[PDB]
Nucleic acid binder design. Structure first.
Ligand code: NA
Ligand code: NA
Length: 430
DNA sequence: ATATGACGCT
DNA sequence: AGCGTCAT
């Protein structure tokens, strides 16, 4: 009544760099700009695997994970940029460096959590408060929100996309409850102003565009982000949640896209997020466990407490390569040679990381996949990482996995390996 | 034959 | 420690 928490304490955004690897290649090669374009890894097998897709190409049905040969059938004029290949493996250094460029700009505006190479969560709570002070009581002009959509508006008693956007924004701002510096809706609005400014700076200083969502927590921010793309941002208010969730498939909510989300759908006989509200917290815990049940109970009401962690650097640095089909590794000599290739890239990236970020990794995780095993990893083993030395890391990696070899003759390697993965972890400040 | 990274469970 | 889950 006067006491239930409504999950409106924070202002949180999620920024997704639009088809990021494509933009990186389009910046470098202007001939690819404003065209149907994709980024592909490798080339011999069916033209290579597509890993990023321009919005012009998406309109022809081209998607990630598609074979480039198949993408060309959907989009004959598709332009392709190829991921750099180093030591016979994909090398993502150009995109990591671009990601760092963006993160350093974002950091000037608010607290950033690196979510992936192309996504960051943003905690705007303190930046909003400070901006509310500077603003004084001056009202928020629509000119400060030139790319913002207000989810759920316009509503109530013009057929162009941009006209609908401005209608909803005018309706939101007209209503906007500004006498109170503690209105959650006002705080979200100021957060959206800051994100416009942040996105403007990113585009001016790198050429890169992005989409964003602004709401009260990470899950709603991420959901908001996907509602209006590309190069747009969406504000999802607490009040918009009942209507938004009433037709929102459960699998669209972060962390419910897999087996848990499935189980929610099958056990409860529901399909939309909003249908979760009819269950008590105990009943959800009974089906899905105490933590998951409490989380679903809060989440279906728009409430989620996962903090934006102040960390722009990845916690682990890893290198992996799959060896599919007939390329699976079947000799001891192959296994050793590719462990060295992986270890040499890893030494390079670790040395750059130590100079850039004043830290050293202390543990080496070795993971492999054996042919026939659908799992990401068939086995993981760890050993100490004391020298940034490719030959020692690769030798040590072989040592900890060599006993997995089933074959009688140790010149051969059985069962064949379909993946090798080296990951450096357990960093210490250096 | 759709390269990574974070984190949960035990 | 080592495996399972979810994700970009
Ligand atoms: Na008003
Ligand atoms: Na309000």
């Amino acid at each position: 009544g006067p006491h239930m928490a409504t999950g409106q304490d924070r202002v949180v955004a999620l920024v997704d760099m639009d088809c990021f690897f494509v933009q990186v290649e389009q910046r470098q090669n202007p001939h690819l700009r404003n065209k149907p374009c994709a980024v592909v890894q490798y080339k011999s097998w069916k033209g290579g695997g597509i890993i990023a897709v321009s919005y012009e190409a998406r309109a022809f049905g081209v998607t990630r994970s598609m074979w480039a040969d198949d993408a060309k059938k959907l989009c004959p004029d598709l332009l392709l940029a190829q991921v750099r290949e180093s030591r016979g493996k994909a090398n993502l250094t150009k995109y990591r460096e671009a990601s760092v460029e963006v993160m350093e700009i974002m950091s000037r505006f608010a607290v950033i959590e690196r979510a992936s190479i192309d996504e960051a969560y943003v905690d705007l709570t303190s930046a909003v408060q400070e901006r509310l002070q500077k603003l004084q009581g001056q009202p928020i002009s629509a000119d400060l929100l030139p790319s913002t959509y207000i989810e759920g508006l316009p509503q109530g008693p013009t057929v162009q996309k941009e006209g609908m956007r401005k209608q909803g924004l005018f309706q939101w701002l007209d209503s906007l409850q500004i006498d109170n510096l503690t209105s959650p809706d006002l705080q979200l609005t100021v957060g959206a102003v800051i994100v416009e400014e942040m996105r403007a700076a990113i585009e001016r200083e790198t050429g890169f565009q992005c989409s964003a969502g602004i709401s009260h927590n990470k899950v709603l921010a991420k959901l908001a982000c996907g509602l209006n793309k590309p190069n747009r941002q969406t504000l999802v208010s607490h009040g918009s949640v009942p209507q938004l969730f009433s037709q929102m498939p459960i699998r669209k909510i972060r962390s419910l896209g897999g087996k848990l989300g499935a189980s929610v759908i099958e056990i409860l006989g529901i399909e939309y997020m909003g249908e979760l509200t009819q269950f008590t917290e105990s009943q959800l815990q009974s089906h899905f466990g105490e933590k998951n049940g409490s989380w679903l109970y809060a989440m279906c009401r728009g409430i989620e407490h996962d903090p934006v962690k102040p960390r722009q650097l990845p916690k682990t640095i890893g290198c992996s390569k799959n060896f599919p089909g007939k390329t699976a590794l079947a000799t001891r000599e192959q296994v050793q040679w590719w462990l060295l290739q992986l270890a040499q890239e890893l030494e390079e990236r670790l040395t750059k990381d130590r100079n850039d970020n004043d830290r050293v990794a202390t543990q080496l995780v070795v993971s492999i996949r054996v042919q026939g095993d659908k799992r990401l990893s068939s086995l993981r083993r760890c050993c100490a990482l004391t020298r940034y030395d490719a030959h020692k890391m690769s030798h040590d990696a072989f040592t900890v996995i060599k006993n997995c070899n089933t074959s009688g003759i140790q010149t051969e390697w059985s069962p064949p390996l379909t993946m090798l993965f080296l990951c450096a972890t357990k960093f210490s400040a250096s």
